[PDB]
Design a binder for this molecule. Structure first.
Ligand SMILES: *C(N)[C@@H]1CCCN1C(=O)[C@@H]1CC[C@H](CNC(=O)Nc2ccc(C(=O)OC)cc2)N1
Lengths: 726, 726
């Protein structure tokens, strides 16, 4: 029949997925941007009006890469001169457009090279970070109030995170949190003074005669970590003559005794904020609930109002302690914590009572709490059909935990088994986002009866294009290893014949709490391999995997590079025995943690794999950052876990690579998994006399995502796999 | 028949070449070291005695990597703790052994981390450099006299060269010159104050948590160059209380007018020293002859005693102005300079007369002046058989230039056509070193009648081993391009059949004044390719090549990356038309300048080559050092040669690589041709969407010569070529 999904289709994105990204501005309306203008929609009836015409900025004279409308609907923040930094961080120039007077504000404009900017939750106040210091604008056209004066490049960070906090704890560059009505602005300050610097060359454009050396405060495992302080300022009590006063919230003592981290900040009410702290040994965390003292001006966090969250089997939380969701009065809150059986469920706390009450239970987990009304609590879980890789929205009656209703399970069970949700301001409405196994489907619903209002986007256009192409199919199932079931997925070539023996590629990540076997619909490299090259692309979730309880997830505690790699080998072993797999052509590849596992597997001497590809792999844990590495490995000291740190390197397995074909790939400007990691792998291979293939990508970082580098790497990897299988 | 010369034979050196490295200690005796002890030989009769037993240092407690006996025969300098720096530089620890009292000197020992050490030409005085300062020891066991106090790491160098002077002008780390009888010690001082630093990462052993950044003063084309000063000190007029006085010799004015270099220093007599200076635009050089002023204590260089050496067609000298050879009284000297016809011959100068007299002439060149007696001048040239790739020793009667006798041409014309020589102290005897086309042959001769005394080493052992192996043959011939003949060589597979079509590999360097077609016997990678893989490995000397006159050598003046690469393509074109070449399988490879030419050829769009390998290539001249690059390219300024600098990059030819298979290789710690050069090539290829192969070598420098890296790179290159040809 017709054509197949080719590499060019993947690299040129010939088959595009349609989305419906909306932004709720109230409990009844949302903004829906288009290639040109922004419309405002009425959720109840579906009618719309133009919020702001596309031409409006025809002669702005700058390429605008993003807008941000004040909660007010009164102003629009125009972002341009975007310059990316790390995974989330970047700098840019900003201009504010007054939607009232339809005029661009030209006075007291936000400075260029601004690091972060954000409106207050309600009015139109602005808070931004420039040169590592925090500034606040009460009105768009008025002078800014400086909040901090200690900002110093690569040393003191006010309102923004340093490298490790951005990548590993807040997943954001922002380190400031406005109170509910905008009165208070809370923020964190990081000090990297004694944090060592990772240094690497950046070659830049051909015209640069001498390469530049990039240096960034980056704490590797066991190194000196940055320290943190927390402050809260009243933005209603600032002059312009007085240097605003930031009230610091310190402790707790159980944390100050040694190295620790600030891992969460969540406002409870107008005058109550909650903070979660984590010891460097991420076995123990403490939440403080602090109240603003009217006549004192300071903040007090009553003990007895603090809650301890610890683990005896591993670290706390999936990647960090979960965030609390406070009831309206801020006197109680709900939060996801691990069960006595090791399953993460919603517990209900009274702010001044130590024991909480689990409101959900079972051998499945709550992925996240999505909304809270005085009536119900909405959450996503993988309870349905007992499929860990499925996601559905549920609502539980606060008055009777016995009454739990699934809101998405039955909408279209064939096409939709993986959902995410987006509620309006007061949860009056919600958009459901189906991402698989069928084509993504976006719909709108009203919470009063959970009635489906209408279909927002059904990807019918893409559906029409795909019926003329031989697409692969996807199989989601499980195998059983000593009592326990472990899930896997396989992207199967079109016209799959179980009597035929296909070459198999094991797509791996396998990091702690990861999930590579799910019901999500994807159009990627694997789609091409299966559709055009007739390769089966499988993924397996073994020990260390997430969303299935702690017995499985914590199985690799203090032992990275053991069970999770062994299980990938075992999975391949079972696959090669299902009947439709050519055991002479089994390969493996992964990126980052997956590059590490791929390398550990290729050097295991198992002999199960013929070839493999490792992209930006970790090679030895002492080279990776402290927050992530130590969370699972503890400290690289003789008193703690040094022996296993030394036993789990890729380099020690070099000799075993004589039995496989290896392709090692790494971006030279990788600020995350340093090129150093692959540099040591190659040196060990050379020292043992093992031949292999390699490819460096000049000035590319961890994503090797530039348009040209992206196309080049996948093209290179395609040739390698085909050669290995042909 | 028997076996072939395999890759393992090459990498494991199974067929070893024997040498006969002797060291003349007088006009009648020489030292000949063995794996264990050092013998002393009488040149006249050939008898010997043990100079010093191997066991002598059984319990020295340190691995001695080299010895140096004082001209005195009284002391022995023991070098250990050797730590290599650049191509010639290194540091080490030294101990002095008294051969008189058979005792190790334990007092006032030479400090560790010493940068350079050397005995005086006669007695047993010592001069060494430590921490960039010069020290002198009049007696081995006595305290040292400090000569300089300005030494500062990476900034001020006294007695030693900085990076660029070591690599490009003196081909040595040493920058000190003793006078004939040891009375004076002349030295250069380099100042790298404003020289930019090249910075690159060094990963070191796996245990290093953070990579270190190496930084070295390195002036790239057009950058700020180091400056130089010259001094002479009387080592007989030093106290121990007074800070010795160094007399500075400055100028000439024609040099001080702008950037310049010190390019040669040669003592003429006990009280006369000659210095050669070169302008940054290496078109003009000046020699000064300076005399010690008895009653003044200073040195005066009379104008009228200085000689100008310039070129209108190119730069001066092969790589720099040649060194003079002074007659006994220092009132005249001989030196190689370019003819009016462009051929380098020996000219005879009167120190105070401007015009010199050529004593040799013809369409061939004098390679070097080897010895001078009041009777004859001994020199090596390629006059014999008009073969530019041949080398023979000649002697010319100073009383009658008409009388020129070849001393090696007829010794064994079949086996020996390439000689180097080593004369005794007063040229009473000389050792001839035959290096090809047959097995290397070492012999001894007496100068009075040029009688052959005996054979020192004939490599009969290796000869016996090779008769049991199918070795390739070597063809040295020429082709004709518009009137001029250009030589080439081909390593031919055993049992070569001219009726058969063989794949061909073009081994290239092609840098200015290079010569890749000669009569030298070699056992290398090419030997394996021809013997075992049946590949013809050819090399061609086109425009820019040396030893054939300036019309050819200066053809690429101010135009690197043009005629020398075009000629390699043309050569391949003619080879592919000789009848025994498969024009579908022609490849090209080179290292450093050869990597540049290989890359320029592969990107020429000629289509003549199927594949190629570039190792540590230059990619754009602005990235290479100033002394070398500018010598041929001038300055990268709009007023000078910037346009061609920009027109001769490899990056601008990226698009053309779509038609070839390319392998790019580079050591990450290459301090000479920076990794940066290959980093920019790969980026340009990626940006154009061209697939290629790559291999970086962690912590390897320009030689990629570590035992493991050496074996690995050739093994990798072997797979690539075989795949390309199979
Ligand atoms: C690579 N060879 C780089 C690129 C351009 C200049 N360069 C150097 O290393 C310069 C050349 C002169 C000086 C000292 N090094 C050498 O002289 N190296 C050398 C290498 C290869 C040959 C050869 O193949 O001769 C037939 C000769 C000399 N740094």
């Amino acid at each position: 029949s017709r054509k197949t999904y080719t590499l060019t289709d993947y690299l040129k994105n010939t088959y595009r997925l349609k989305l419906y990204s909306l932004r709720w501005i109230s409990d009844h309306e949302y903004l829906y941007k288009q290639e040109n203008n922004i419309l405002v929609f009425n959720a109840e009836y579906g009618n719309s009006s133009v919020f702001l015409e596309n031409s409006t900025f025809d002669e702005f004279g700058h390429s605008i890469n993003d807008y941000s409308i004040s909660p007010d609907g009164q102003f629009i923040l125009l972002e341009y001169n975007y310059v990316k930094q790390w995974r989330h961080s970047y700098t840019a120039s900003y201009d504010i457009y007054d939607l009232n007077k339809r005029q661009l504000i030209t006075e007291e404009r936000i400075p260029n090279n601004t690091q972060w900017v954000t409106w207050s939750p309600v009015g139109h106040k602005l808070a931004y970070v420039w040169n590592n210091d925090i500034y606040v604008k009460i009105e768009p056209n008025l002078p800014s109030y400086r909040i901090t004066w200690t900002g110093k490049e690569d040393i003191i960070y006010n309102g923004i995170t340093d490298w490790v906090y951005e990548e590993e704890v807040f997943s954001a560059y922002s380190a400031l949190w406005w109170s509910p009505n905008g009165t208070f602005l809370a923020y964190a300050q990081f000090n990297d003074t004694e944090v060592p610097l990772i240094e690497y060359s950046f070659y830049s454009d051909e015209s640069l005669q001498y390469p530049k050396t990039v240096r960034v405060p980056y704490p590797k495992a066991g190194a000196v970590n940055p320290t943190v302080k927390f402050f809260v300022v009243n933005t209603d009590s600032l002059s312009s003559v007085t240097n605003a006063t930031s009230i610091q919230i310190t402790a707790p003592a159980s944390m100050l005794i040694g190295d620790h981290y600030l891992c969460d900040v969540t406002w409870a009410t107008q005058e109550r904020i909650s903070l979660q702290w984590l010891r460097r040994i991420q076995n123990y965390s403490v939440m403080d609930i602090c109240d603003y003292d009217e006549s004192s001006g300071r903040w007090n966090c009553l003990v007895a109002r603090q809650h301890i969250e610890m683990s005896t089997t591993g670290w706390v939380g999936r990647f960090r302690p979960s965030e609390p969701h406070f009831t309206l009065d801020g006197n109680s809150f709900y939060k996801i914590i691990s069960n006595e059986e090791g399953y993460r469920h919603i517990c209900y706390f009274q702010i001044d009572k130590k024991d909480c009450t689990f409101i959900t239970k079972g051998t499945w987990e709550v992925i996240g709490i999505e909304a809270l009304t005085s009536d119900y609590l909405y959450y996503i879980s993988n309870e349905y059909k007992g499929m860990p890789g499925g996601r559905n929205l549920y609502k539980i009656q606060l008055s009777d935990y016995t009454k739990v209703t699934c809101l998405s399970c039955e909408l279209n069970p064939e096409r939709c088994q993986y959902y995410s949700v987006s509620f309006s301001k007061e949860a009056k409405y919600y958009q459901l986002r189906c991402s698989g196994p069928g084509l993504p489907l976006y719909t709108l619903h009203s919470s009063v009866n959970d009635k489906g209002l209408r279909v927002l986007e059904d990807n019918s256009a893409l559906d029409k294009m795909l019926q003329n192409v031989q697409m692969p199919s996807k199989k989601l199932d499980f195998i059983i290893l000593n009592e326990t079931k472990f899930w896997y997925q396989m992207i199967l070539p079109p016209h799959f014949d179980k009597s035929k023996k296909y070459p198999l590629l094991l797509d791996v990540y396998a990091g702690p709490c990861s999930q590579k076997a799910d019901t999500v619909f994807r159009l990627n490299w694997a789609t091409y391999l299966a559709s055009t090259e007739n390769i089966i692309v499988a993924s397996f979730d073994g020990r260390g995997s997430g969303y299935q309880g702690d017995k499985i997830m914590h199985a690799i505690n203090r032992r990275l590079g053991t069970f999770e790699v062994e299980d990938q080998i075992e999975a391949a072993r079972q696959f090669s025995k299902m009947g439709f797999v050519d055991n002479k052509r089994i390969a493996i590849w992964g990126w980052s943690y997956g590059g590490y596992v791929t390398s550990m597997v290729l050097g295991s001497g198992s002999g199960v794999f013929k070839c493999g590809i490792a992209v930006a792999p970790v090679s030895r844990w002492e080279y990776y950052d402290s927050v992530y590495t130590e969370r699972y490995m503890g400290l690289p000291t003789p008193e703690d876990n040094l022996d296993h740190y030394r036993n789990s390197t890729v380099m020690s397995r070099a000799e075993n690579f004589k039995q496989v074909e290896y392709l090692l790939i790494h971006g030279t400007a990788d600020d995350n998994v340093h090129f150093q990691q692959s540099a040591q792998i190659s040196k060990a291979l050379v020292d043992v006399g093992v031949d292999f293939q390699a490819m460096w990508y000049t000035d590319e970082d961890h994503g090797i995502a530039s348009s040209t580098a992206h196309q080049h790497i996948y093209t290179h990897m395609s040739h390698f796999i085909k050669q290995c299988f042909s």
